[PDB]
Every structure is written in C-alpha cells, then in structure tokens.
Design an enzyme around this catalytic site. Structure first.
Site, PDB file in Angstrom:
ATOM      1  N   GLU A  62       1.548 -47.300 -14.169  1.00 44.99           N
ATOM      2  CA  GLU A  62       1.206 -45.866 -14.096  1.00 44.99           C
ATOM      3  C   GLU A  62       0.367 -45.481 -15.313  1.00 44.99           C
ATOM      4  OE1 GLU A  62       3.986 -43.933 -10.728  1.00 44.99           O
ATOM      5  OE2 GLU A  62       4.813 -43.727 -12.776  1.00 44.99           O
ATOM      6  N   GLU A 110       4.908 -49.197  -6.323  1.00 45.57           N
ATOM      7  CA  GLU A 110       6.103 -48.346  -6.250  1.00 45.57           C
ATOM      8  C   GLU A 110       6.012 -47.616  -4.930  1.00 45.57           C
ATOM      9  OE1 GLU A 110       7.336 -46.231  -9.908  1.00 45.57           O
ATOM     10  OE2 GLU A 110       5.368 -46.999 -10.643  1.00 45.57           O
TER      11      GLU A 110
HETATM   12  O1  LIG Z   1       9.684 -32.113 -10.059  1.00 51.49           O
HETATM   13  N1  LIG Z   1       8.964 -33.010 -10.217  1.00 51.49           N
HETATM   14  O2  LIG Z   1       7.808 -33.137  -9.684  1.00 51.49           O
HETATM   15  C1  LIG Z   1       9.308 -34.046 -11.168  1.00 51.49           C
HETATM   16  C2  LIG Z   1       9.847 -33.729 -12.322  1.00 51.49           C
HETATM   17  C3  LIG Z   1      10.039 -34.778 -13.182  1.00 51.49           C
HETATM   18  C4  LIG Z   1       9.851 -36.077 -13.008  1.00 51.49           C
HETATM   19  O3  LIG Z   1      10.189 -36.883 -14.042  1.00 51.49           O
HETATM   20  C5  LIG Z   1       9.594 -38.145 -14.227  1.00 51.49           C
HETATM   21  O4  LIG Z   1      10.025 -39.081 -13.199  1.00 51.49           O
HETATM   22  C6  LIG Z   1       9.363 -40.244 -13.107  1.00 51.49           C
HETATM   23  C7  LIG Z   1       9.690 -40.996 -14.318  1.00 51.49           C
HETATM   24  O5  LIG Z   1       8.961 -42.182 -13.851  1.00 51.49           O
HETATM   25  C8  LIG Z   1       9.396 -40.145 -15.586  1.00 51.49           C
HETATM   26  O6  LIG Z   1       9.977 -40.866 -16.700  1.00 51.49           O
HETATM   27  C9  LIG Z   1       9.497 -40.664 -18.026  1.00 51.49           C
HETATM   28  O7  LIG Z   1       8.810 -41.948 -18.274  1.00 51.49           O
HETATM   29  C10 LIG Z   1       8.350 -41.764 -19.722  1.00 51.49           C
HETATM   30  C11 LIG Z   1       9.548 -41.804 -20.701  1.00 51.49           C
HETATM   31  O8  LIG Z   1       8.964 -41.785 -22.037  1.00 51.49           O
HETATM   32  C12 LIG Z   1       9.964 -41.986 -23.068  1.00 51.49           C
HETATM   33  O9  LIG Z   1      10.294 -40.699 -23.569  1.00 51.49           O
HETATM   34  C13 LIG Z   1      11.119 -40.734 -24.741  1.00 51.49           C
HETATM   35  C14 LIG Z   1      10.408 -41.459 -25.857  1.00 51.49           C
HETATM   36  O10 LIG Z   1      11.183 -41.500 -27.054  1.00 51.49           O
HETATM   37  C15 LIG Z   1       9.935 -42.849 -25.472  1.00 51.49           C
HETATM   38  O11 LIG Z   1       9.078 -43.223 -26.510  1.00 51.49           O
HETATM   39  C16 LIG Z   1       9.185 -42.745 -24.148  1.00 51.49           C
HETATM   40  O12 LIG Z   1       8.985 -44.072 -23.731  1.00 51.49           O
HETATM   41  C17 LIG Z   1      10.429 -40.647 -20.353  1.00 51.49           C
HETATM   42  O13 LIG Z   1      11.658 -40.980 -21.018  1.00 51.49           O
HETATM   43  C18 LIG Z   1      10.775 -40.577 -18.882  1.00 51.49           C
HETATM   44  O14 LIG Z   1      11.458 -39.363 -18.599  1.00 51.49           O
HETATM   45  C19 LIG Z   1       9.929 -38.737 -15.492  1.00 51.49           C
HETATM   46  F1  LIG Z   1       9.437 -38.008 -16.507  1.00 51.49           F
HETATM   47  C20 LIG Z   1       9.224 -36.479 -11.848  1.00 51.49           C
HETATM   48  C21 LIG Z   1       8.966 -35.442 -10.936  1.00 51.49           C
HETATM   49  N2  LIG Z   1       8.637 -35.751  -9.621  1.00 51.49           N
HETATM   50  O15 LIG Z   1       8.941 -36.736  -9.192  1.00 51.49           O
HETATM   51  O16 LIG Z   1       8.862 -34.910  -8.635  1.00 51.49           O
HETATM   52  C1  LIG Z   2       7.198 -45.031 -10.718  1.00 54.96           C
HETATM   53  O1  LIG Z   2       7.911 -44.007 -10.020  1.00 54.96           O
HETATM   54  C2  LIG Z   2       9.291 -44.286  -9.790  1.00 54.96           C
HETATM   55  C3  LIG Z   2      10.023 -44.486 -11.102  1.00 54.96           C
HETATM   56  O2  LIG Z   2      11.336 -44.889 -10.734  1.00 54.96           O
HETATM   57  C4  LIG Z   2       9.328 -45.475 -11.953  1.00 54.96           C
HETATM   58  O3  LIG Z   2       9.904 -45.425 -13.275  1.00 54.96           O
HETATM   59  C5  LIG Z   2      10.540 -46.616 -13.719  1.00 54.96           C
HETATM   60  O4  LIG Z   2      11.723 -46.741 -12.916  1.00 54.96           O
HETATM   61  C6  LIG Z   2      12.422 -47.939 -13.245  1.00 54.96           C
HETATM   62  C7  LIG Z   2      12.915 -47.846 -14.675  1.00 54.96           C
HETATM   63  O5  LIG Z   2      13.553 -49.067 -15.018  1.00 54.96           O
HETATM   64  C8  LIG Z   2      11.769 -47.601 -15.613  1.00 54.96           C
HETATM   65  O6  LIG Z   2      12.334 -47.222 -16.903  1.00 54.96           O
HETATM   66  C9  LIG Z   2      11.796 -47.915 -18.017  1.00 54.96           C
HETATM   67  O7  LIG Z   2      12.400 -49.218 -18.027  1.00 54.96           O
HETATM   68  C10 LIG Z   2      11.999 -49.971 -19.179  1.00 54.96           C
HETATM   69  C11 LIG Z   2      12.505 -49.280 -20.412  1.00 54.96           C
HETATM   70  O8  LIG Z   2      12.070 -50.005 -21.604  1.00 54.96           O
HETATM   71  C12 LIG Z   2      11.902 -47.889 -20.491  1.00 54.96           C
HETATM   72  O9  LIG Z   2      12.450 -47.193 -21.638  1.00 54.96           O
HETATM   73  C13 LIG Z   2      12.221 -47.144 -19.207  1.00 54.96           C
HETATM   74  O10 LIG Z   2      11.529 -45.892 -19.201  1.00 54.96           O
HETATM   75  C14 LIG Z   2      10.918 -46.427 -15.139  1.00 54.96           C
HETATM   76  O11 LIG Z   2       9.789 -46.275 -15.975  1.00 54.96           O
HETATM   77  C15 LIG Z   2       7.860 -45.202 -12.051  1.00 54.96           C
HETATM   78  F1  LIG Z   2       7.243 -46.279 -12.712  1.00 54.96           F
END
Ligand SMILES: O=[N+]([O-])c1ccc(O[C@@H]2OC[C@@H](O)[C@H](O[C@@H]3OC[C@@H](O[C@@H]4OC[C@@H](O)[C@H](O)[C@H]4O)[C@H](O)[C@H]3O)[C@H]2F)cc1[N+](=O)[O-]
Ligand SMILES: *[C@H]1OC[C@@H](O)[C@H](O[C@@H]2OC[C@@H](O)[C@H](O[C@@H]3OC[C@@H](O)[C@H](O)[C@H]3O)[C@H]2O)[C@H]1F
Length: 324
Positions: free
Chosen positions: A116, A212
């Site tokens: 992504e 995905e």
């Molecule tokens: O309503 N929606 O449309 C909605 C709302 C939210 C949402 O959340 C995301 O879901 C998909 C997931 O793949 C995302 O995950 C983020 O990935 C990035 C991560 O970054 C970490 O953040 C903390 C930081 O310290 C670290 O360095 C960094 O790696 C974050 O933790 C995750 O939350 C969600 F954000 C999706 C949608 N939608 O689906 O509908």
């Molecule tokens: C694409 O959309 C669907 C989400 O489910 C996906 O996000 C990934 O889902 C699987 C998780 O295992 C992954 O989380 C990461 O796993 C590795 C960790 O090191 C990291 O901190 C954690 O965020 C999601 O990113 C999305 F890709």
C-alpha cells in the site's frame, strides 16, 4: 524480470492473512492453498521467526512455511512508519536477514515491500519508496535470490485517495516484478481506483496481483452489509445469493475483464471482527467476516469458481507453473 516467478498463464489462488485464519480455511475447505500470506515489519522482523500478534491475527512465517511446505509464500513487509530511515540504510541488516530467510525456504516468494505504497497512513515519502524498491530489487540479485523472490509494488487502490497520483510512487520497471492492488469496497467509487491500478500495471507491462481482497463491510456468517465504513452501523440483511452477486461475482469479473494482466490474488478469509484491531467498537474501520466457509452457498460457489482451469491451485506441478 521478464516473466520470472510470473505464471505464463493462469491466476495464482492464495489465501491470507494470518496463520490461524489460513489453517481454518485449509481445514474447512479440505484443501492445501497454492499460496499463503503473512506480514512482517522491517524494523523488528516481527512475525518472521516467531509469533507476532498485534490484533490483526497471528503472524509466524517460520510456522507458516513449515505448515505449507509446497505452497508459495506471500509476505507483506511493513516499513513501520520508517521508510526514510529504511531508505537511508538503518535497517539493511534486517533486509538481508529477511531476504536470506525467505530464500532459505526454496520456494516462490512474493514480497510486497512497503505494501500500500500510496496509502497516506503508511507515512511514506515518494523518495523513500523509490529508493528502497531499487535497493531491495538490487539486493535480491546481489544475494543470489532472484530465482526465488519476486518483488511486488502494491498500491492501496482506496477510493478516498484521489486518482491520478501513482507516478510519484513508481521506482521504474527495472525494479518491480508485479504491480499489486487492494480490492475491498471498489463500488464506493465505481471501480475507479482499482481500474486505475490495473491500467497502470498494464501500461508498465507488469502482471497484476490482487494482494488484499475481502468483501469489506459484509458479514458472511450473519449475512449482513453496512454502508458505514467507520462503525458498521445500520446493517442490512442480505441473502447469501445477494452477498455472492454483490461482491464475489464482480470480484471474479474484474479478474476476467483484466485477464491480460491478472496473474494472482490473495483472498483474506477471516473473522475480522474477532481480531482486536478490526473489532468493535471499530477504531480502525469496519471490516466484517469474510470466511467463505461460514455460509454453505458462499463456500460452494467459491470452491466451484476457483476449481476452474484459469486458476492455479495446489498440485505437484505448482512451482513449475509459477516459474520456479
Ligand atoms: O472508516 N474508514 O474508512 C476507515 C477508518 C479507518 C481505517 O483504518 C485503517 O485500516 C487499515 C489499516 O490497514 C490502517 O492501519 C494503520 O497502518 C499504519 C500504522 O502505522 C503505525 O502507527 C503507529 C506508529 O508508531 C508506527 O510507526 C506506524 O507504523 C497504524 O498503526 C495503523 O492504524 C488503519 F489506519 C480504515 C478505514 N476503512 O477501512 O474504512
Ligand atoms: C490492506 O488492507 C487490509 C489490512 O488488513 C491490511 O493491513 C495489514 O493487515 C495485516 C496486519 O498484520 C498488518 O499489520 C502490520 O503487521 C506488521 C507489523 O510490523 C506492523 O506494525 C503492522 O501494522 C496490516 O498492516 C492492509 F495492508
């Protein structure tokens, strides 16, 4: 890479995206999946050699690889918010270990580096993505693993992110073996994002992997749908044929409409609601329940579709078919 680890014909069927949900699928369907999918983070290598469960299902590539020794591995590699430090070399020992470990499994590996790439939530810079794809594609060759590890550049194809912005993320055709996308709720924008990703792959001459995919906002066991992406409210009853016709038939139709380029998919088959990141009261969006085995009609129709001969399922010839 000129068709290396890309099947000459056919669409690889893979399942994801945590060990337990993949085992449950294989059990319920009475099948060995052709490909299996987990995630690891590059900062800690969490999930590579031991369990990592952070609310999205358990990841353990060593366990997965031993449980499915004659299936392709598909691995998402997160930059953990640090792609610029990754591009500057701070994690190079970890990259080598990741690549050497995956190559030690002696099987096709599809590596979704910084998956992504254009999802803003991943904190990526264009520079960091372009540099790190270059570095990793070259390092695979330097380490001697280019017959085993295929590098996937996967976009998010997410409707709320505007179209027309893919070029800044592209590192060059020489550094990418596949383009990938995410197929969740493409109906929210008329399939525009997923079509734009497909036409980008096509223009670059790359095969497309749907890395995905899930019937997002649908519940298979419950037979419901919600239009609310944040909280899943005001759920609507659906018949099981409706849920097949609304999400699954168009998903397979998209692959047929793009059959010049589609060469693989990963179907995420899980009770997302049971996994705390994706669970009520929904701090990171509403996901649902995508388990095909949780409805008899969905399960039948799924098995009937993917048994067709355009799909590449598990058999003793799988690695040969994939170019290994
Ligand atoms: O309503 N929606 O449309 C909605 C709302 C939210 C949402 O959340 C995301 O879901 C998909 C997931 O793949 C995302 O995950 C983020 O990935 C990035 C991560 O970054 C970490 O953040 C903390 C930081 O310290 C670290 O360095 C960094 O790696 C974050 O933790 C995750 O939350 C969600 F954000 C999706 C949608 N939608 O689906 O509908
Ligand atoms: C694409 O959309 C669907 C989400 O489910 C996906 O996000 C990934 O889902 C699987 C998780 O295992 C992954 O989380 C990461 O796993 C590795 C960790 O090191 C990291 O901190 C954690 O965020 C999601 O990113 C999305 F890709």
């Amino acid at each position: 890479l000129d068709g290396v680890l890309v099947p000459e014909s056919g669409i690889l069927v893979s399942v994801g995206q945590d060990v337990d949900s993949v085992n449950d699928y294989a059990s319920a369907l009475g099948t060995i999946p052709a490909g299996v999918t987990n995630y690891v983070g590059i900062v800690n290598l969490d999930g590579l050699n031991s369990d990592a469960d952070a609310g999205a299902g358990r990841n353990n590539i060593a366990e997965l690889a031993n449980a499915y020794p004659t299936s392709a591995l598909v691995v998402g590699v997160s930059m953990n918010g640090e792609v610029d430090a990754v591009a500057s070399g701070r994690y190079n020992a970890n990259i080598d270990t990741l690549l050497n470990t995956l190559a030690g499994y002696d099987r096709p590996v599809y590596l979704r580096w910084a998956y992504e790439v254009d999802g803003p939530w991943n904190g990526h810079s264009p520079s960091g993505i372009v540099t790190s794809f270059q570095y990793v594609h070259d390092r695979i060759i330097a380490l001697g693993h280019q017959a085993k590890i295929s590098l996937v550049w996967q976009v998010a194809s997410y409707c709320p992110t505007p179209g027309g912005q893919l070029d800044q993320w592209w590192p060059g055709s020489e550094y990418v073996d596949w383009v990938g996308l995410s197929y969740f709720a493409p109906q929210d924008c008329n399939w525009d994002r997923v079509n734009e990703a497909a036409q980008f792959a096509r223009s670059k001459g790359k095969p497309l992997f749907l890395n995905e995919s899930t019937p997002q906002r649908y519940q298979v066991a419950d037979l419901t749908y919600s239009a609310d992406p944040a909280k899943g409210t005001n759920r609507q009853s659906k018949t099981s044929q409706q849920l097949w016709d609304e999400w699954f038939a168009p998903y397979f139709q998209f692959m047929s409409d793009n059959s010049d380029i589609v060469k693989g998919f990963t179907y995420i088959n899980a009770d997302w609601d049971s996994q705390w990141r994706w669970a009520a009261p929904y701090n990171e969006g509403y996901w649902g329940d995508s388990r095909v085995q949780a409805n008899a009609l969905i399960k039948s129709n799924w098995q009937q579709e993917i048994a067709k001969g355009q799909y590449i399922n598990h058999s003793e010839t799988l690695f040969e078919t994939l170019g290994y």
